[PDB]
Coordinates of C-alpha atoms and ligand atoms in Angstrom, one line a residue:
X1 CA 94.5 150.5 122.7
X2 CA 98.0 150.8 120.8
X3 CA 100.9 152.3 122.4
X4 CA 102.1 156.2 121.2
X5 CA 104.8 156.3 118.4
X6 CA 105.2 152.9 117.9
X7 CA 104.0 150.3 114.9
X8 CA 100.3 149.4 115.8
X9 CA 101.4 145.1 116.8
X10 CA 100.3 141.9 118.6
X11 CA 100.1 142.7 122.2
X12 CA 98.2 139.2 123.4
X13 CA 98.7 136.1 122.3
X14 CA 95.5 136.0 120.6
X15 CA 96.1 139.1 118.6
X16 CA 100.1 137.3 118.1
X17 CA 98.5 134.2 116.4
X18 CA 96.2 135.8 114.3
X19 CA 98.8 138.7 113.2
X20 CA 100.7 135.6 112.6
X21 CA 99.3 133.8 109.8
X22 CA 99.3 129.6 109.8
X23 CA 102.3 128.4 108.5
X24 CA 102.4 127.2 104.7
X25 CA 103.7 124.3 102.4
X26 CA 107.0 125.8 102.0
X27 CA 107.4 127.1 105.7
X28 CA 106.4 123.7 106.9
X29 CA 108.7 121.9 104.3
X30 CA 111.9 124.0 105.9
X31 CA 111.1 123.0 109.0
X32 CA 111.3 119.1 107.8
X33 CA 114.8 120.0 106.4
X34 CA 115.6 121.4 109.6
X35 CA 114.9 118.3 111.3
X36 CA 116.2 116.0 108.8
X37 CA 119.5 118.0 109.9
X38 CA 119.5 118.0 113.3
X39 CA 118.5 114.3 113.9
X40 CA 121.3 113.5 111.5
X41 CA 119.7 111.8 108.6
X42 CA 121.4 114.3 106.4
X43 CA 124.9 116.2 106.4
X44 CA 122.5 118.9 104.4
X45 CA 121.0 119.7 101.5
X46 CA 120.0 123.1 98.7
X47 CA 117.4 123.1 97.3
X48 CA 116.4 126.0 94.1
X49 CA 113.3 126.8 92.3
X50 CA 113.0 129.6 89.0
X51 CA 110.0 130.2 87.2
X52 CA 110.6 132.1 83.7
X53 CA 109.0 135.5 84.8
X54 CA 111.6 136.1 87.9
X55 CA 108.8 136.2 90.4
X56 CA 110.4 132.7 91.5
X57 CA 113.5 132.7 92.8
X58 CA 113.8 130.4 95.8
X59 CA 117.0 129.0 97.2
X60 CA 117.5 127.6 100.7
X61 CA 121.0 126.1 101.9
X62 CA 120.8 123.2 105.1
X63 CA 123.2 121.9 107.0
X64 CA 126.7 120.9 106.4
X65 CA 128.8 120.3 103.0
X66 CA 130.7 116.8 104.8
X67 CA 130.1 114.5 108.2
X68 CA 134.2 116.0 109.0
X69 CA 134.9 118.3 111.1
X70 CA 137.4 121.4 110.4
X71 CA 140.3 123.2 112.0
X72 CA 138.1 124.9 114.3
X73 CA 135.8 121.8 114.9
X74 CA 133.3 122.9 113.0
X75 CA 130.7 121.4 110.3
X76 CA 131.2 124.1 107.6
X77 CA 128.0 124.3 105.8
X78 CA 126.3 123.6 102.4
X79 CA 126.4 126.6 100.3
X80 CA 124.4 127.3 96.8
X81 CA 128.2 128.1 95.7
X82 CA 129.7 124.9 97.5
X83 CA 131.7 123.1 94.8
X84 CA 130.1 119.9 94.3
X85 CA 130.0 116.5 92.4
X86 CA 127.6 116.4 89.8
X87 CA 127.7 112.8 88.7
X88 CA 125.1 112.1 86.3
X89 CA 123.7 115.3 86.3
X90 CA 126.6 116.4 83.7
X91 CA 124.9 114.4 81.2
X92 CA 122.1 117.4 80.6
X93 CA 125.7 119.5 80.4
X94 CA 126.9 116.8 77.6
X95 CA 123.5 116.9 75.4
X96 CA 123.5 120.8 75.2
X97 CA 126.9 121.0 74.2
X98 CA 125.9 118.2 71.6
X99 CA 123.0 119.9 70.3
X100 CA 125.3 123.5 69.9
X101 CA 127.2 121.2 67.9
X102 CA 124.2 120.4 65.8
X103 CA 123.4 124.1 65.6
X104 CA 126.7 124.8 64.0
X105 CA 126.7 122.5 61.0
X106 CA 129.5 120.4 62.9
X107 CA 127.1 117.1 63.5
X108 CA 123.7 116.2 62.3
X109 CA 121.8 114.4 65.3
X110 CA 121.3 111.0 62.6
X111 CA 124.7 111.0 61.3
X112 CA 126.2 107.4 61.9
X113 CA 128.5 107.9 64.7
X114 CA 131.6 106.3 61.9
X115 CA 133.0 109.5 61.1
X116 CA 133.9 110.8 64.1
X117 CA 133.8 108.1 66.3
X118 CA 135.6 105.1 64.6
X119 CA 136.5 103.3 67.6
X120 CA 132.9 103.3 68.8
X121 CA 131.7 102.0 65.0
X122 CA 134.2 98.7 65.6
X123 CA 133.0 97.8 69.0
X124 CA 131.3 94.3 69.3
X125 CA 128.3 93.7 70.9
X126 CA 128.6 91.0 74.0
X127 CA 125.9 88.3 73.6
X128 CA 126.5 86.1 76.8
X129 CA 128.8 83.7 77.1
X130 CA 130.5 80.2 75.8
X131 CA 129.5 76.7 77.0
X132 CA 133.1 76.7 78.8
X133 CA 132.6 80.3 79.3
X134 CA 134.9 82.4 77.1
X135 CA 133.7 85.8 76.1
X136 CA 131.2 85.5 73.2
X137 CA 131.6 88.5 70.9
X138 CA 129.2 89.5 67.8
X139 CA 129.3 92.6 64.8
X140 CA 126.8 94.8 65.7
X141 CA 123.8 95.0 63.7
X142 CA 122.4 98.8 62.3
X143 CA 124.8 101.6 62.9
X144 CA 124.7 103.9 66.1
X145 CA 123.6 107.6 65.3
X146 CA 124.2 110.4 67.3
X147 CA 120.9 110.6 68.8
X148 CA 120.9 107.0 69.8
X149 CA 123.6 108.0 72.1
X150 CA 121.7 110.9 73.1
X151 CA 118.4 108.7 74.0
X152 CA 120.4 105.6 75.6
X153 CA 119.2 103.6 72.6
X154 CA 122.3 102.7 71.5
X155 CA 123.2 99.2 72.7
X156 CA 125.7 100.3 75.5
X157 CA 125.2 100.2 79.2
X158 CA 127.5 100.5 82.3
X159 CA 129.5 97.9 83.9
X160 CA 127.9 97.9 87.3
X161 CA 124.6 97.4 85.9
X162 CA 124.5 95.5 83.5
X163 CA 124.6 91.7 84.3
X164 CA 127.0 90.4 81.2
X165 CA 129.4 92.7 81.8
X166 CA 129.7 92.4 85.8
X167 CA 130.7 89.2 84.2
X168 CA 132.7 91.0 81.6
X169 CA 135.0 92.4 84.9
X170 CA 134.7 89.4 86.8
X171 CA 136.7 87.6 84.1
X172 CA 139.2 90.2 84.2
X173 CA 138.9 91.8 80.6
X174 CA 139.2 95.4 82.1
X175 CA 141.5 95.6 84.4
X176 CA 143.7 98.0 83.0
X177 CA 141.0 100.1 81.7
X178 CA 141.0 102.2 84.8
X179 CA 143.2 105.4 85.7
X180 CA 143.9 106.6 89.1
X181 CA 141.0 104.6 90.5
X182 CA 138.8 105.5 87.9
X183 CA 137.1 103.2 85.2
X184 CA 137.0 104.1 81.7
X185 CA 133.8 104.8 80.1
X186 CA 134.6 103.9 76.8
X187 CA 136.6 100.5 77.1
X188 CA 133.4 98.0 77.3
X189 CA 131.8 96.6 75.1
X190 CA 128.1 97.1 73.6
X191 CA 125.2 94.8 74.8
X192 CA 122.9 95.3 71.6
X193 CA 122.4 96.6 68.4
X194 CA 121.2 100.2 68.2
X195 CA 117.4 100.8 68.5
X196 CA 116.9 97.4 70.1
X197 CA 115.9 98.7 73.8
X198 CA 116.8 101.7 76.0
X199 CA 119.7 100.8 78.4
X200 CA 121.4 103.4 80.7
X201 CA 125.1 103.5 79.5
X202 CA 128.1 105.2 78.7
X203 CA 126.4 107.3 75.8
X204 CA 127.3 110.6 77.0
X205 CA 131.1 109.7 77.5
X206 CA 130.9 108.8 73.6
X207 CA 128.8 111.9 73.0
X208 CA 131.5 114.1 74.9
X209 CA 134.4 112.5 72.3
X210 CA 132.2 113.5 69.4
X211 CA 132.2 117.1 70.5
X212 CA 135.6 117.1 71.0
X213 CA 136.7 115.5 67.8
X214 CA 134.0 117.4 66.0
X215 CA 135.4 121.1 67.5
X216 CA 138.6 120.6 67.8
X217 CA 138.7 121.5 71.3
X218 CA 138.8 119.4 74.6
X219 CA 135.4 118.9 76.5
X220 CA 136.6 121.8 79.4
X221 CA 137.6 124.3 77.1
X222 CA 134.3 123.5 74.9
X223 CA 132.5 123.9 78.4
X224 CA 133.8 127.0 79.4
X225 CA 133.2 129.0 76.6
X226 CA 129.8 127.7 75.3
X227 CA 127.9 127.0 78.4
X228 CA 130.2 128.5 81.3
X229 CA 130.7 131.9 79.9
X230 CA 127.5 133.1 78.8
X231 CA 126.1 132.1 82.2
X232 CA 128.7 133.8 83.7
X233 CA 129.9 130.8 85.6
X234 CA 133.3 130.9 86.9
X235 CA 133.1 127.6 89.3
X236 CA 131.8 124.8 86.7
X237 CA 134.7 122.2 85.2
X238 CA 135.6 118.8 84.5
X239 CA 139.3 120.1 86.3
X240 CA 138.6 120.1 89.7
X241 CA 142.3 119.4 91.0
X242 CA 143.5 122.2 89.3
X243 CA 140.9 124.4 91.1
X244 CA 143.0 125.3 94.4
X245 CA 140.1 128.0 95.3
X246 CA 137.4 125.6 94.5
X247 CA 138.7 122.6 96.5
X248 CA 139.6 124.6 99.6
X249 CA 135.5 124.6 99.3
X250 CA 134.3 121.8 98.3
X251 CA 131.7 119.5 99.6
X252 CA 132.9 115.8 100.8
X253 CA 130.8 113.3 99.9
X254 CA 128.8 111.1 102.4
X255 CA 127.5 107.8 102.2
X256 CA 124.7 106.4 104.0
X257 CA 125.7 102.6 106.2
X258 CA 123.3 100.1 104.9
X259 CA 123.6 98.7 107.8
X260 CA 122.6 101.2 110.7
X261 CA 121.4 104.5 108.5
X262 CA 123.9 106.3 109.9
X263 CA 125.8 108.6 108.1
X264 CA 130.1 108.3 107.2
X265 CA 132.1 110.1 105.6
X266 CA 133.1 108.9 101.9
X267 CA 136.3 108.9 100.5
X268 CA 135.0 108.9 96.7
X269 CA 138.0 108.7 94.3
X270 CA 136.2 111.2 92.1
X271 CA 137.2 114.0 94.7
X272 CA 141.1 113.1 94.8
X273 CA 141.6 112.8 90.9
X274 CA 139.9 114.5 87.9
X275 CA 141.5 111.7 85.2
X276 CA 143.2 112.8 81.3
X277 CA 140.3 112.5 80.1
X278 CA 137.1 114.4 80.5
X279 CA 134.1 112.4 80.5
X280 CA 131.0 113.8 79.3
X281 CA 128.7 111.4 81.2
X282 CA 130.1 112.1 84.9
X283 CA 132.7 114.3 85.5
X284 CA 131.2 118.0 86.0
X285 CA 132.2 119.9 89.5
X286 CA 130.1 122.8 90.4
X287 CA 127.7 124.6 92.4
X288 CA 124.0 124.1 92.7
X289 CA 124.0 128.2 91.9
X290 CA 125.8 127.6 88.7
X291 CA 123.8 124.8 87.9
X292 CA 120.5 126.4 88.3
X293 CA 121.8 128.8 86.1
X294 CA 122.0 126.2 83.4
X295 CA 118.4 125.0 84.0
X296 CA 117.0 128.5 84.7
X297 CA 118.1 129.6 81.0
X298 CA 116.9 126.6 79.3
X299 CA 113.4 127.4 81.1
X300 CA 113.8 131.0 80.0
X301 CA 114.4 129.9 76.3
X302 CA 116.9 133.2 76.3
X303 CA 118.8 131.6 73.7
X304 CA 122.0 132.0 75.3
X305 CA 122.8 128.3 75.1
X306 CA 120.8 127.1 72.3
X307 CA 118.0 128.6 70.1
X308 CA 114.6 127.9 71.8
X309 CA 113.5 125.8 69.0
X310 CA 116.2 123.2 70.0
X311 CA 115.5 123.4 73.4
X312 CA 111.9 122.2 72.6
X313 CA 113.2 119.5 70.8
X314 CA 115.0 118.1 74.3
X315 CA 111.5 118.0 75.8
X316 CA 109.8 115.6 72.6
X317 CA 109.2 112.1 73.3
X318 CA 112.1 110.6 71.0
X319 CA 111.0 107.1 71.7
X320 CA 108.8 105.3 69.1
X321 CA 105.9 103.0 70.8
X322 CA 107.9 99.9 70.9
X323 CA 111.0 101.4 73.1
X324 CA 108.4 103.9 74.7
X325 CA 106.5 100.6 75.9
X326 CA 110.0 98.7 77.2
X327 CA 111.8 101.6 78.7
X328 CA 108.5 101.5 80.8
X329 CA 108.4 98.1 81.6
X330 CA 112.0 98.0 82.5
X331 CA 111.3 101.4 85.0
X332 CA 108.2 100.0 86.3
X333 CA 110.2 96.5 87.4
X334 CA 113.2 98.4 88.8
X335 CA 112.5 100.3 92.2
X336 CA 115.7 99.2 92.8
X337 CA 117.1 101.5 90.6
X338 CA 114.4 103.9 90.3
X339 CA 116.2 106.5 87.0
X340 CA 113.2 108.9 88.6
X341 CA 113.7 109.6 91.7
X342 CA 111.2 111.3 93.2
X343 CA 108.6 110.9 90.5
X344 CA 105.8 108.1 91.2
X345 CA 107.6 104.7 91.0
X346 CA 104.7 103.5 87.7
X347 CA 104.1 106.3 85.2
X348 CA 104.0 106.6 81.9
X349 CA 107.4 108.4 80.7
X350 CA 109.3 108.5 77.7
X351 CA 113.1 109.8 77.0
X352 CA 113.9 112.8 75.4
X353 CA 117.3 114.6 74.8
X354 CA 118.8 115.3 78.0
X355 CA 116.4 113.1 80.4
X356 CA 113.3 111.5 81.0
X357 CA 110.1 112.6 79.9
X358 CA 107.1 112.5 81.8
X359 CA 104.0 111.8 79.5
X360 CA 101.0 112.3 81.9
X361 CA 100.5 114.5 85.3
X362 CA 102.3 113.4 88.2
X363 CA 99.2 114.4 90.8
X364 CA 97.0 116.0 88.1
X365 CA 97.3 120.0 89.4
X366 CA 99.3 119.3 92.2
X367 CA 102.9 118.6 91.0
X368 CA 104.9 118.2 88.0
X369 CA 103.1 118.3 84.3
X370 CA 102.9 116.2 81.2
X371 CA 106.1 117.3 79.0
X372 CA 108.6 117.9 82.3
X373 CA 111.8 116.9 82.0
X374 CA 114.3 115.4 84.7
X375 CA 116.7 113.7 85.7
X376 CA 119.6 113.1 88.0
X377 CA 123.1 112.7 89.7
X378 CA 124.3 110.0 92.0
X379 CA 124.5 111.7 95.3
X380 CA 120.8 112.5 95.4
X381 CA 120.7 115.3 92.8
X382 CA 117.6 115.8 91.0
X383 CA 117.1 118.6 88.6
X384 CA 113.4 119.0 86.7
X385 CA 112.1 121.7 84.6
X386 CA 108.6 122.0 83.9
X387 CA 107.6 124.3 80.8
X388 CA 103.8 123.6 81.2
X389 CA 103.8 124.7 85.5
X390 CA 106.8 127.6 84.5
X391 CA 109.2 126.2 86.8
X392 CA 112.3 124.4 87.4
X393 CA 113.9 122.8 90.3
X394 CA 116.8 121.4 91.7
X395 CA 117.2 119.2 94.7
X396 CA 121.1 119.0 95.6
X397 CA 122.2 116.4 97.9
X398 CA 126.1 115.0 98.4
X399 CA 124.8 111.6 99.9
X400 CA 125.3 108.0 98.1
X401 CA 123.9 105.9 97.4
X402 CA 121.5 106.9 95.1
X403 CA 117.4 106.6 95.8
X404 CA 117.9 107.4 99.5
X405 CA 114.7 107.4 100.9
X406 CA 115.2 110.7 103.5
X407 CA 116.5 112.4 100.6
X408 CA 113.6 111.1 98.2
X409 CA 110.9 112.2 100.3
X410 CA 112.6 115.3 101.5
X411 CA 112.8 115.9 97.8
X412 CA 109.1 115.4 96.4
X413 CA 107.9 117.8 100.1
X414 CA 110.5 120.1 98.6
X415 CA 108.7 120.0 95.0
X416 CA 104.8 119.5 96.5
X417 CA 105.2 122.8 98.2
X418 CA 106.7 124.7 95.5
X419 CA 104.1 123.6 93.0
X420 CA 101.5 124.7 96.0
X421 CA 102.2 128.3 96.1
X422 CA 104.3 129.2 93.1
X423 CA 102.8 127.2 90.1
X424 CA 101.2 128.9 87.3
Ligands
MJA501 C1 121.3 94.7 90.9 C2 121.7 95.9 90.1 C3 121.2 97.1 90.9 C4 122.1 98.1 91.3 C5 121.5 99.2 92.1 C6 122.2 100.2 92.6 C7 123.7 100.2 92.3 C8 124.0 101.1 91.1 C9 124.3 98.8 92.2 C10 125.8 98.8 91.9 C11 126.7 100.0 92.4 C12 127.4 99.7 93.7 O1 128.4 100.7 93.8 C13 126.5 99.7 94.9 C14 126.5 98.4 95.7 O2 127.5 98.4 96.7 C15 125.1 98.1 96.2 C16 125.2 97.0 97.3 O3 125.3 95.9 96.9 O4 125.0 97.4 98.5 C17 123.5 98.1 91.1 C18 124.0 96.6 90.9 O5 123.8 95.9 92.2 C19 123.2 95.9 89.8
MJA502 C1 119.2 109.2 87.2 C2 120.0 108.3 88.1 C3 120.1 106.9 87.5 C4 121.0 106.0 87.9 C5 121.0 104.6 87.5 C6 121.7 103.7 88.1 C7 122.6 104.1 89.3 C8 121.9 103.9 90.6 C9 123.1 105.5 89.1 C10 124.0 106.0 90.3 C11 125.3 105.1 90.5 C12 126.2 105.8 91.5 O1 125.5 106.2 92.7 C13 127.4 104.9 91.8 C14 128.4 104.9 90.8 O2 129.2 106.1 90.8 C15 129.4 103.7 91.0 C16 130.2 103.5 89.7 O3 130.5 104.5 89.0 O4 130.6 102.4 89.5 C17 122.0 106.5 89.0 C18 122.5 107.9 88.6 O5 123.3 107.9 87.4 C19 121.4 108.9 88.4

């Protein structure tokens, strides 16, 4: 029997095994990170869950923050407060400071864009091209509203999605709308009239010039003191490069070979020059910590961003049937693309303000609910927060190109077994 002063333990390995108990849903989902590490088929990954109540508070950190080595030949590793590229995931960032704008008096979310956006208002739409093949230019039909831009329903799209206006660089009509490497957002033109079909554009970049025309102030300083400071975030900005403590830090991004799978490291322009200008739909540095803390206290409804009340109006379908049914159709037909990452490739989803909306259960009690919202950055980010299950997560990779499928499935074992044991 047990030994004299010391903790009654396993002295067999039958009693070892059976003190030990069989491994769970998130032990097991660790140990695929782990591998996904050590075979290579990521530099690394963190990954964060919060429910409301603070009996969820899950962060785990994998792996490396680049594919280069250091001073001391080293991989440094992927921290939750490793500066990182947000991409796309500053458009949630954009749409809250839009909507304290809203709660101000400043804008009203179906003001016509005219006042404060002029330039936007005299943009044509592009409707294909001439039987020689110059560029074929219309008036737009309706006026754009501030939660057109808000919803992608506004008529403008990006140029490396959109087929016309591939075409539109091809011929060489923007050029010299690019700074240090990087394209402007606000230089193209429209591809329809407002409230004609969802398209994924350049609404946030628009949306960020409103708040700064509307405020007075420039979208960093609007940033740090209305969603930076009452966080408490000190390593969030649009500035990285003049960030000398941050960029001593700072992830490198990798890209994946589409050739091999093998992993390279990626010298993006994004991480040698910020730009003038600071653009709402893209330009965000920070940490996954910082940006939990962003998605944590919208979850909370603690009203230290916005008043709950607006923050349930981010999570209402804002789609009427007719672009509910097309922004559908269009996800359904583009795997290729795939705005949802992890989320089954058909389901019915509408948008809200902010990100996608998912209008039925994922795996009915399994996973994420009716009403979550989501979406996502370009190197694999995906944030969710599901009010109905009480929790929020964030899945941060720095790994183009987007839809990776080792990051995709690493990311929905990440979510199964946090909806497993933690949901409520
Ligand atoms: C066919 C459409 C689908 C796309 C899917 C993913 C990317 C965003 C594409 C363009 C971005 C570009 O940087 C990536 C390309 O190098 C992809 C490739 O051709 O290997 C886009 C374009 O190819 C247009
Ligand atoms: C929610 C996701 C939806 C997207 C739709 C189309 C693209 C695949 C997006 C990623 C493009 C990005 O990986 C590459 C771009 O940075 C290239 C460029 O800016 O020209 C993606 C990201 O914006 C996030």
């Amino acid at each position: 029997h047990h030994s004299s002063g010391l903790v009654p333990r396993g002295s067999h390995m039958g009693s070892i095994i059976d003190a030990a108990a069989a491994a769970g849903p998130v032990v097991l989902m660790e140990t695929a990170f782990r591998k996904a590490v050590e075979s290579r088929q990521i530099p690394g990954a963190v990954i964060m869950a919060r429910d409301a109540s603070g009996n969820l508070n899950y962060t785990r950190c994998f792996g490396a923050r680049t594919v280069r080595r250091d001073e001391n030949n080293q991989l440094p590793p992927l921290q939750v407060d490793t500066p990182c590229r947000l991409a796309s995931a500053t458009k949630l960032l954009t749409t809250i400071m839009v909507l304290q704008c809203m709660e101000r008096g400043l804008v009203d979310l179906d003001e016509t864009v005219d006042r404060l956006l002029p330039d936007l208002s005299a943009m044509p739409v592009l409707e294909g091209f001439d039987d020689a093949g110059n560029a074929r230019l219309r008036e737009r039909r309706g006026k754009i509203t501030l939660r057109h831009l808000l919803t992608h329903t506004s008529g403008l799209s990006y140029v490396f999605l959109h087929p016309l206006l591939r075409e539109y660089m091809a011929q060489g009509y923007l050029q010299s709308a690019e700074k240090f490497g990087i394209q402007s957002r606000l230089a193209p033109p429209a591809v329809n009239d407002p409230g004609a079909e969802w398209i994924y554009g350049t609404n946030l970049d628009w949306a960020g010039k409103l708040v700064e025309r509307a405020t007075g102030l420039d979208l960093e300083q609007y940033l740090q003191e209305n969603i930076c400071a009452p966080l408490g975030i000190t390593d969030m900005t649009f500035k990285l490069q003049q960030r000398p403590d941050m960029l001593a830090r700072r992830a490198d991004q990798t890209h994946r070979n589409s050739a091999d799978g093998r992993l390279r490291y990626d010298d993006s322009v994004y991480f040698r020059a910020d730009g003038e200008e600071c653009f709402g739909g893209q330009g965000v540095f920070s940490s996954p910590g910082s940006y939990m803390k962003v998605l944590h206290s919208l979850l909370k409804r603690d009203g230290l961003l916005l008043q709950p009340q607006t923050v349930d109006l981010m999570f209402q379908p804002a789609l009427e049937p007719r672009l509910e049914e097309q922004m559908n159709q269009h996800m359904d037909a583009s795997p290729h693309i795939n705005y949802g990452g992890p989320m089954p490739m058909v389901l019915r989803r509408s948008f809200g303000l902010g990100g996608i909306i998912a209008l039925e259960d994922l795996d009915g009690e399994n996973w994420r609910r009716k009403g979550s919202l989501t979406f996502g950055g370009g190197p694999n980010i995906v944030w969710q927060i599901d009010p109905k299950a009480g929790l929020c997560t964030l899945a941060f990779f720095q790994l183009e190109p987007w839809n990776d499928p080792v990051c995709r499935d690493l990311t929905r074992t990440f979510e199964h077994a946090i909806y497993a044991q933690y949901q409520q």
